[PDB]
Write a protein that binds this ligand. Structure first.
Ligand SMILES: *[C][C@](*)(C(*)([O])=O)C(*)(*)(*)([N])C(*)(*)([O])=O
Ligand SMILES: *[C][C@](*)(C(*)([O])=O)C(*)(*)(*)([N])C(*)(*)([O])=O
Lengths: 227, 227
């Protein structure tokens, strides 16, 4: 009966891998009928998120979301947007469409409250420009913001490696480096692509790092979260 | 602009992995905007397909499809059902809903015509009961039907291993065995789960076997097939 709608494609590789996680972390006992009921709107054609801010038409982007939320509100019970940045348009949307919503920022916020140690916000320059975490989280004093320099190095990783579907473990060495620099053993997948990393770490059984990955957190607690 | 709708979840593991293939086999050059626009209805709760035939209510199952096709006809340009068996309900659906459809049986049929050697139809007992390939394919004389005995051994693989998300390569030895028995170096993923195998073979670079996997064939030729 209960159905999740996912407005994704903003990271189509991640979008796919996220759905894969949902069934990985909710494997049925006897019958498939048991398993999670998901709807995925995978639209890569969504106007570039970090590039919609740096041009005149954020107007075009907000429309995209509104249109697709109007659809998903009918077909789903709960709704998730598979892009953190993308949440920046939610001020502009009428409150009725956001009734079913589950903020990736709120999920990250709760996770960080329980973990309760300083944690590095891994996000692109454009994700940071929107200040979604600094405004949105109650646990904001525990968030370590990257330097503008390192935000661009993370922009490289996301777009040049992760988004292109290459092995997430390749960037691991560069991420371990940052973690020592900013002096934590933990990260927030500000940019959703780090769902891909989060998995690859768990797969390798590398427990040295604590990952606050909202998409993992959703997948795992699907049975609870979806009403 | 062009959008594919996928009525899936009949194999939720496959459904996820299929979407992953779409982006694996259509990796963008410069911008993600380029990439494939997909909608996925992943509903595991679809009444058991092989078990809907062996009870009174195939009536319940046909409704499920019709309802979801009515939806997808609005939101998509082309439509695919992520289950071969599931095509057995298409006689009962009004022709207007099937205007956008892409038959997994037709795709398998074309592929087999070009390959043009005897090829083993790997499918469950229930998939066979519906005789979808024997009636649907023009290339039907090239299809080698499994023995009823071996259909149940494939039922085991599908449900006990593949559907439960375990490594598809584990069954490989048992599949190589069948291929030698029925005396081919080729197979048809009658049951869609063998998308999972098809990938795992390609990943390993095992070219000894020729796989007629419709879901691979769709993913690869997305740019062409979707109008
Ligand atoms: C901005 C990035 C994206 O996917 O468009 C990032 N993954 C995000 O939104 O969190
Ligand atoms: C019957 C099986 C299923 O997925 O329900 C098989 N994968 C098929 O339909 O091809």
């Amino acid at each position: 009966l209960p159905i999740l709608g996912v407005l994704g494609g903003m990271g189509p590789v991640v979008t796919a891998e996220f759905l894969k996680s949902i069934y990985e972390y909710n494997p049925f006992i006897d019958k498939e009928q048991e398993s999670p009921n998901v709807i995925v709107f995978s639209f890569p054609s969504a106007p570039d998120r970090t590039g919609s801010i740096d041009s005149g038409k954020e107007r075009e982007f907000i429309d995209f979301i509104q249109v697709n939320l109007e659809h998903l509100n009918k077909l789903a019970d709960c709704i998730v947007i598979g892009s953190c940045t993308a949440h920046y348009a939610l001020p502009q949307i009428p409150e009725n469409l956001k009734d079913k919503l589950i903020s990736l920022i709120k999920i990250a916020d709760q996770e960080l409250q329980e973990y309760n140690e300083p944690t590095l916000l891994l996000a692109s320059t454009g994700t940071y420009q929107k200040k979604l975490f600094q405004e949105g989280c109650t646990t904001a004093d525990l968030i370590i913001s990257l330097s503008e320099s390192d935000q661009k190095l993370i922009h490289e990783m996301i777009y040049k490696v992760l988004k292109r579907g290459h092995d997430p473990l390749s960037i691991l060495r560069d991420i371990e480096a940052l973690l020592e620099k900013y002096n934590t053993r933990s990260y927030i997948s500000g940019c959703t692509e780090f769902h891909l990393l989060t998995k690859s770490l768990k797969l390798k059984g590398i427990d040295s790092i604590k990952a606050i990955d909202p998409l993992s957190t959703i997948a795992q607690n699907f049975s609870q979260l979806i009403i």
